[PDB]
Amino acid sequence: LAEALHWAL
Ligand SMILES: [Co+2]
């Protein structure tokens, strides 16, 4: 989930 957010941001 941390990386999903990194990608999104
Ligand atoms: Co990352």
Amino acid at 2: A
- Tokens representing residue 3 in the block: 């990386």
CA of residue 3 to ligand 1 center, whole Å: 5
Q: What is the spatial distance between Cα 3 and Cα 9, in angstroms, rounded to a whole number?
A: 10
Which residue type does 9 have? Answer: L
Which residue is associated with the tokens 């990608």?
A: 7
Report CA Rg, the chain: 5
- The structure tokens listed for 7 are 């990608």
Scanning 1-9, the segments in alpha helix (DSSP H) are 2-8
For 6, the token pair is 């990194």
CA 8 / ligand 1 centre spacing (Å): 10
Residue type for position 5: L
Separation of alpha carbons 6 and 9, rounded Å: 5
Whole-number Å distance, alpha carbon 2 to ligand 1 midpoint, is 7
